């Protein structure tokens, strides 16, 4: 009754018992491998090519399917350590990456790695993006959502990176991959279909997501129903809380190899 699908799964979900909600979050989805990959990032081995931040294998999937074809100047706001960063710097059609984070006592310190075109790539902390000035760029990214057990607090949050993103999406991005961390209020269908109008795009599902988020990013290269699309990821994690778990589908981690300018 007046609550959309997403709001009759979250609610649920803040009522699960502790193991409930333990067993529940990998149930399902997929997982990359990251065992091998952080002796690694504290051996200090810049070589290997192994991924700093579970995000780019996450970026990995949506670029493998025409989600989003970067090319020319990239923009990823919060990168943090850079997980998006390095993986955008191996794809070919790009030539100038930056990165921005605070990376302050509120969050994750940047890390510098050596992976295949690191040279491209400009990472530095100690910057707020909602106070920063957007720059023409040809591919826009942002993956800064953050979590709260609150529909409406995640829904107040989300709204302000979209009104921010929306100065970037005024720089005319070629190709953009926007995290939307709540997508499933009466609001938030309105506002984003409303981006999309002018701006173009749709919304997809990466099943490298958890069970316990309904983030979805919205991409250039998908232009789907924006108020089916999302309850179809609502209707989808729904299921998942009543029957007997699953078992999580791993893969191998995003390997960027290592080298120089090409
Ligand atoms: C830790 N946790 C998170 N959630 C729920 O999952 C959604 C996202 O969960 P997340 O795991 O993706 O969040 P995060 O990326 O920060 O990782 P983590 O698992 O460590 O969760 C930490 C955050 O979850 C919140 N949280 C902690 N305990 C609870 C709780 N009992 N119920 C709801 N939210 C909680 C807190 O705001 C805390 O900051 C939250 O909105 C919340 O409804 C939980 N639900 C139950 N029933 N029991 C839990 O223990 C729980
Ligand atoms: N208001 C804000 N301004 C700048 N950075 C922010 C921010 N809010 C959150 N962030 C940053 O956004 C990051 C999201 S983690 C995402 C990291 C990277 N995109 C990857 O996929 O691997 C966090 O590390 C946090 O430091």
Known sequence: ?????????????????????????????????????????????????????????????????????????????????????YYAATIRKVQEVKGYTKGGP??????????????????????????????????????????????????????????????????????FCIKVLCPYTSTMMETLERLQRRYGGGLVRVPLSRNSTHEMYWVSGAKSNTIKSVSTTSQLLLGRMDGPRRPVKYEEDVNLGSGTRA
């Open 106 to 175: 509120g969050h994750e310190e940047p890390m510098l790695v050596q992976s295949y075109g690191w040279n491209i790539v400009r990472l530095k902390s100690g910057v707020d993006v909602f106070h920063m000035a957007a720059e023409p760029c040809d591919t826009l990214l942002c993956d800064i959502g953050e979590s709260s057990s609150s529909p409406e607090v995640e829904e107040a949050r989300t709204l302000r990176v979209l009104s921010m993103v929306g100065d970037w999406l005024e720089k005319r991005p070629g190709a």
């Open 1 to 85: 009754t007046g609550e959309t699908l997403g709001e009759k799964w979250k609610a649920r979900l803040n009522q699960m018992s502790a193991l409930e909600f333990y067993s529940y979050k990998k149930s399902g989805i997929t997982e990359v491998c990251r065992e091998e990959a952080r002796r690694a990032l504290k051996d200090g081995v810049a070589t290997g090519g192994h991924a700093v931040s579970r995000g780019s294998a996450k970026l990995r999937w949506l670029v493998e399917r025409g989600y989003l074809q970067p090319y020319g100047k990239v923009i990823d706001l919060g990168c943090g350590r850079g997980g998006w960063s």
